[PDB]
Paper text:
Dynein-2 is a large multiprotein complex that powers retrograde intraflagellar transport (IFT) of cargoes within cilia/flagella, but the molecular mechanism underlying this function is still emerging. Distinctively, dynein-2 contains two identical force-generating heavy chains that interact with two different intermediate chains ([name] and [name]). Dynein-2 is the essential motor for retrograde intraflagellar transport (IFT), the conserved process in which polymeric IFT “trains” translocate cargoes along the ciliary microtubules. A 3.9 Å resolution structure shows how [name] and [name] use surprisingly different interactions to engage equivalent sites of the two heavy chains.
[name] and [name] both contain a C-terminal β-propeller domain, with 22% sequence identity. Each β-propeller has seven radially arranged blades, the seventh of which is distorted in [name] giving the propeller a more elliptical appearance (top row). Conversely, the equivalent interaction is lacking in [name]: the loop from bundle 3 of [name] is disordered and the residues of [name] around the mouth of the pore are poorly conserved. This [name] insert, which is absent in [name], stabilizes the bundle 3/4 junction of [name] in a “straight” conformation. Our cryo-EM structures show that the [name] β-propeller is distorted relative to [name] and uses a unique insert in its third blade to stabilize [name] in a straight confirmation. The only notable shared interaction that [name] and [name] use to engage [name] involves E355 ([name])/D881 ([name]) contacting R587 of [name]. [name] mutation R587C is associated with severe short-rib thoracic dysplasia. In summary, [name] and [name] use strikingly different interactions to engage the two copies of [name] and stabilize them in different conformations.
Author numbering:
A (entry chain E): 313 to 339
B (entry chain A): 170 to 317, 321 to 465, 480 to 655, 664 to 771
C (entry chain G), F (entry chain H): 3 to 95
D (entry chain D): 104 to 133
E (entry chain C): 574 to 774, 792 to 1057
The structure:
């Protein structure tokens, strides 16, 4: 989402979260 | 007698002495001697190389004993005796140790290295003794010496004579490759040497010793003839390269110094003379090219290097080329080059002295080191502290040592600035380190927090702003280094602590991101409240609200990323189920 | 972060297998088809359970920490835990 | 047939020398 | 279907961290497979193939960080068989501003010419580094203003900063600990050139670093290691990087520049010192290089040993600096040294006089490197600022060079020799070169020249024994 | 001939184990004691039967050549062939 408020473990967790959301849609 | 009696004498006088001055004087000598005395009680145990080093050690120690002035000077008649008994204790030791070998045909490097330890002890110790007494201690006007060493001078030269000649004997039997003629000559060499175990000096046998060495050289003269044929062939095989040909003549030199072989090789020596004469024409063209083509200190270094090259060429020629007639023309023409080089070196050193001494009043080169020169400056345009200064100070220390190493005396004005420049250079290198720390810590904040740190950065930079208003003393500069280190530590401590509270709030935000919200909502809200009060404990550490706004804006975005996701899956949980 | 690290491994010299597995024996990440991903996940889960059992029969006071498995066609590599494990596969070296 | 044990040990020592040197060397479990 | 256990297993930050760690382990195993397998042949020529040999490989300058930086260092490990380490200037212009403020080190394999295996970046000008005395863990470095600094080649790949340069991804490893943090003023007040791994005979780990000033003041350090550290960083010991493993602790002070001086003065009279090397047979024996043409001798915990100074063959002083030392790695107590005069010496530790000395070879110019080949025990490589390289071989001849190469039109800035297999292990005397034009360029020697015949190490003891 | 190779393998850096076992399931001598040798030879033989199946179960046209187990105490190495398999144990490094 936002480039000013970056933080790797949080942002990258949100990438895992989005992969769970997409896995749920696939499943 | 033996050196231990001197040390015992200073032990007695230091304890007993009928006035405090005598006790202290004797103790002062007793301590200097005590270093060498411990080694002299041990002398028979020592290995030869430690005895070689002991010559240098005692050279210094006894030169201090003689020269020190804070008490009545050391007794001269006893000094002569002391030097003689040291020579006696060395002689006894050298005789005992060198006597111990199977002094025929042992594996030569051992025999050579033991022989060289003895020879060099004697050569040095004779050289050193007349240097210390006759040069140094005559020239010491606080207490001039009265003489030139009798045991050392005579017996040291005897030891040189025998040990060199025995070194030559062993090296000669080494030069011989295997054939039946070696067996015949080697047995013939041993036989006249028998009974004449030579390390024990005896002047009643010295004539018989000389006579025996004449028999040895007679047997060897047919051997020298045979050796020279193979040696001259090898020296002709390498003949195209002057570099390699010279290096062959350097290593063979004690074999070549045998006067018979010197005459056998004579055309190879005459062609070496021609080669090295032409090399000196090349060196003269090279030196002319250095006049055609700091730059002056590099010139001084190169012409000193060329004096040492021609001096070597002349010293190599002094044994090797002399006894040729042609060598006289080489010797004078090489001496001319050496003298022209000495002249040009002095010209360049005096001209360098003009460059530096005219620089003592003019800041354009950088030598007038002063408080208006910016050691420290801040790039707020970079986020960095920077530290740089006149390269001329590094060039000053480099050139002032280098000339002193070649052989010059530095003018006292140049010495006194170079003292200060040494201290200044040391501390400028520490200020680089501390600034290179303050540059590195900038990377180690995370972006959103950085306004909280603004106060710590400005405090560290306030130490620049008050100080600019310190070369003035190395003490003050050491304190300035310590002040910047203290402030850099204060910042680094504050940053590292705050970065852990930030990482802690990351942990709580991922712990909340982990949770399907609907069935956990009250526990999720409690964890968000715990996070908000956690942030408030950071505010409790001191900070004013404005910095906390920048940080809490970033945090509100982080928790929004988590909440927004858990909402999106909470909506699909109506579609999918 | 983690996806880029799996992409980093996917790109290496002679490498292609990446499978992340749960202690129910079922996979969670892949650069491979789900049927083959599950063949490797189920087989490695059986094999980890016998490996940990074997280490505890060898020495009950010890425990398992890594497994590596080299075959004429490829080498398989396994990083176990109580809840989770990683499988990777590479050409020989 | 001890020569088969010796031939096995020639093949296996060539690998095992390489692999034990690697496992001696490696950072992989620091 | 997707199961209810998938959500806690994929989501958990501990299980995310388990993929960070497990893939960090996987990455280094795949690198180490490339270190086991790979060949020299990946490039055959891009460059002038030089007089020594037939074949060449470049360390490609098209990597944009290297595209405008000149080179000057090369360092090698004896015990890590195949790591080459290179060092790079600032660009005057034209790349990423973050890197432009910084100096670059690159750590390479002779069999990985595609790029650096790791890239390290630094807050100072560098000119010393050495790789670990065992198990290749760390790179140690010394700098133009006395920082002693350490890189850990293991640390994830993402605690350190990174950039995607053009299409491709690179990371620029900030150093894991620096001396600069230390609060009490005990670090080097000087420029450095020695950074020596003192091999061992104070917990978790132990081996030693010895680093040396131009000034003649020595420090010795131990390497000591946290079990794990908070990602926010150490809060007690500030000199460490965020999350770092390794720190250096200080345990010596030797005033070498005062102590063995040929003294006439206090402030420039003290000897400038140019090196340390520690004897591989026994790390308690070290020798030191000087601007006075002496090589000085020393021991660590005992007070006195002899001979005290290795001398020139000529009497008095022969004042031209010594500019490199090396001990034959085969472990005889013998070493090569050579002056900025062009003069060379070869010594045995048990004699103050050279067992050989030479002068006449490199046209009296500055020699700027002397090294003993780790492949042939007798064979030594010398290099001059006239861009000449020469091999000498003490079993063949000691008159001068056995072979000579003059490079042109490129000048030579740096040259280094490659590491130590056994000959049946495929020993490999490769030279790494750098041009004033700034490319790094590897030339491999013919295996007949590089690999020894029978008993050459003993045959060299027999030379020193017959002489 | 053979026992000299056993001393060569015993000599290795940080190592203290050797066991050879035959394809019929019988151990050869060790630098370890007979109780330990029985326990290791039998347990690892069962584990290698599962291992060689597992690689063949991934591909029947493949076969297995080396194995590693790392554990909290130490690392263990395994190397099988037609008539014999080897166990080696290496202390932490």
């Amino acid at each position: 989402r936002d480039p000013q408020y970056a933080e790797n473990e949080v942002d990258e967790m949100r990438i895992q979260k989005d992969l769970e959301l997409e896995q749920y849609k696939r499943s | 007698l033996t050196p231990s009696d001197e040390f015992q004498f200073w032990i007695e006088q230091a304890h007993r002495g009928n006035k405090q001055i005598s006790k202290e004087r004797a103790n002062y000598f007793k301590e200097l001697f005590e270093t060498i005395a411990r080694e002299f009680y041990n002398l028979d145990s020592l290995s030869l190389l430690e005895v070689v080093d002991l010559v240098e050690t005692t050279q210094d120690v006894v030169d201090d004993v003689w020269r020190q002035t804070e008490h009545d000077h050391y007794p001269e008649s006893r000094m002569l005796h002391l030097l003689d008994i040291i020579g006696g204790s060395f002689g006894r030791f050298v005789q005992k140790k060198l006597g111990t070998l199977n002094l025929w045909e042992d594996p030569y490097y051992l025999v050579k290295e033991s022989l060289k330890a003895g020879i060099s002890i004697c050569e040095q110790w004779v050289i050193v003794c007349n240097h210390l007494t006759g040069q140094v201690w005559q020239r010491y006007v606080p207490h001039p010496w009265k003489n030139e060493p009798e045991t050392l001078d005579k017996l040291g030269k005897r030891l040189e004579e025998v040990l060199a000649i025995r070194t030559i004997h062993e090296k000669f039997l080494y030069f011989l490759p295997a054939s039946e003629e070696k067996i015949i000559c080697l047995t013939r060499v041993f036989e006249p040497f028998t009974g004449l175990n030579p390390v024990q000096y005896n002047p009643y046998t010295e004539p018989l010793w000389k006579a025996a060495v004449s028999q040895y050289e007679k047997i060897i003269a047919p051997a020298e003839q045979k050796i020279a044929g193979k040696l001259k062939n090898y020296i002709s095989e390498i003949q195209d390269s002057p570099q390699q040909l010279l290096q062959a003549f350097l290593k063979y030199k004690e074999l070549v110094k045998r006067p018979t072989i010197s005459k056998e090789l004579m055309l190879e020596r005459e062609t070496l003379l021609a080669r090295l004469v032409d090399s000196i024409k090349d060196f003269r063209l090279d030196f002319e090219n250095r006049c055609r083509g700091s730059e002056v200190v590099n010139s001084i270094v190169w012409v000193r290097q060329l004096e040492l090259k021609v001096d070597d060429t002349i010293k190599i020629a002094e044994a090797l080329l002399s006894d040729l007639p042609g060598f006289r023309c080489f010797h004078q023409s090489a001496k001319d080059l050496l003298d022209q080089l000495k002249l040009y070196e002095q010209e360049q050193f005096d001209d360098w002295s003009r460059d530096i001494q005219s620089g003592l009043s003019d800041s354009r080169s950088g030598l007038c080191i002063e408080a208006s020169s910016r050691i420290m400056e801040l790039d707020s345009n970079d986020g960095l502290l920077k530290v740089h200064y006149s390269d001329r100070l590094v060039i000053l220390l480099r050139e002032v040592r280098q000339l002193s190493a070649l052989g010059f005396v530095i003018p006292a004005k140049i010495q006194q600035v170079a003292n200060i420049a040494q201290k200044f250079c040391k501390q400028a290198i520490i200020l680089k380190q501390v600034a290179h720390f303050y540059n590195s810590i900038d990377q180690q904040m995370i972006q959103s927090q950085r306004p909280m740190m603004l106060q710590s950065a400005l405090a560290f930079e306030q130490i620049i702003k008050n100080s600019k208003a310190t070369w003035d003393n190395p003490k003050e500069l050491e304190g300035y280094i310590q002040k910047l280190q203290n402030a850099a530590e204060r910042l680094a401590t504050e940053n590292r602590k705050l970065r852990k509270w930030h990482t802690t709030f990351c942990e709580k935000v991922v712990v909340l991101m982990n949770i399907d919200l609907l069935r956990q909502q009250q526990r999720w809200k409690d964890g968000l409240q715990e996070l908000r009060t956690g942030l408030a404990t950071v505010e409790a550490q001191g900070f004013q609200a404005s910095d906390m706004h920048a940080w809490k804006q970033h945090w509100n975005h982080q928790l929004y990323k988590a909440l927004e996701h858990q909402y999106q899956m909470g909506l699909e949980a109506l579609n999918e189920n | 972060e983690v996806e880029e690290t799996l992409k980093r491994l996917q790109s290496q010299k002679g490498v292609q297998g990446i499978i992340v597995v749960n202690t129910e024996g079922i996979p969670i990440k892949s650069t491979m088809d789900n049927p083959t991903t599950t063949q490797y996940a189920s087989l490695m889960h059986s094999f980890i359970l016998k490996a940990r059992s074997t280490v505890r029969d060898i020495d009950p006071q010890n425990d398992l920490t890594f497994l590596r498995i080299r075959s004429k066609k490829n080498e398989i590599m396994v990083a176990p835990d109580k809840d989770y494990f990683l499988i990777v596969i590479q050409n020989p070296t | 047939d001890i020569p088969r044990l010796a031939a096995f040990l020639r093949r296996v020592e060539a690998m095992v020398i390489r692999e034990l040197n690697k496992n001696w060397q490696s950072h992989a479990f620091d | 279907t997707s199961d209810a256990v998938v959500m806690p297993k994929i989501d958990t930050p501990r299980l995310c961290s388990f993929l960070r760690a497990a893939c960090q382990v996987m990455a280094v195993l795949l690198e180490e497979d490339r270190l086991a397998a790979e060949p020299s042949w990946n490039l055959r020529a891009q460059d002038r193939a030089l007089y020594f040999s037939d074949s060449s490989s470049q360390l490609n300058t098209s990597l944009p960080f290297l595209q405008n930086r000149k080179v000057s260092s090369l360092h090698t490990s004896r015990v890590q068989r195949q790591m080459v380490v290179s060092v790079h200037d600032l660009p005057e212009k034209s790349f990423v501003p973050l890197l432009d403020s910084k100096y670059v080190l690159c750590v390479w394999d002779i069999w990985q010419p595609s790029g650096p295996q790791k890239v390290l970046i630094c807050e100072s000008q560098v000119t010393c580094c050495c790789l670990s005395p065992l198990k290749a863990f760390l790179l140690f470095a010394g700098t133009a203003h006395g920082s002693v600094v350490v890189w850990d080649l293991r640390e994830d790949s993402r605690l350190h900063y990174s950039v995607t340069l053009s299409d491709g991804f690179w990371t620029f490893r900030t150093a894991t600990f620096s001396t600069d943090g230390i609060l009490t003023s005990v670090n080097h007040r000087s420029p450095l050139q020695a950074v020596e791994p003192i091999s061992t005979s104070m917990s978790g780990l132990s081996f030693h670093i010895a680093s040396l000033d131009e000034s003649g003041v020595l420090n010795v350090w131990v390497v000591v290691e946290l079990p794990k550290a908070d990602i926010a960083g150490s809060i007690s010991d500030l000199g460490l990087m965020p999350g770092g493993r390794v720190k250096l602790v200080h345990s010596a002070l030797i005033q070498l520049g005062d102590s063995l001086s040929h003294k006439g003065n206090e402030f420039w009279g003290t000897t400038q010192t140019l090196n340390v090397k520690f004897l591989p047979s026994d790390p308690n024996h070290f020798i030191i290089g000087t601007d006075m043409g002496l090589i000085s001798h020393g021991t660590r915990q005992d007070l006195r040993v002899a001979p005290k100074l290795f001398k020139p063959q000529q009497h008095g002083i022969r004042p031209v600096k010594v500019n490199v030392i090396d001990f034959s790695p085969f472990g005889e107590p013998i070493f090569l040294a050579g002056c900025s005069d062009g003069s060379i010496r070869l010594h045995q530790l048990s004699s103050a006089f050279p067992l050989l000395q030479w002068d006449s070879s490199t046209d009296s110019h500055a020699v700027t490197g002397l090294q003993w080949s780790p492949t042939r025990p007798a064979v030594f490589l010398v290099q001059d600022d006239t861009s000449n390289i020469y091999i000498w071989d003490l079993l063949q001849s000691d008159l001068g060079p056995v072979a000579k190469q003059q490079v042109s039109p490129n000048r030579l800035v740096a040259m280094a020799a490659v590491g130590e297999p056994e000959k049946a292990g495929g020993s490999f005397l490769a030279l790494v070169l750098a041009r004033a034009s700034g490319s790094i360029d590897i030339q491999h020697l013919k295996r007949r020249w590089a690999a020894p015949e029978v008993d050459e190490c003993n045959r060299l003891r027999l030379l020193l024994q017959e002489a």
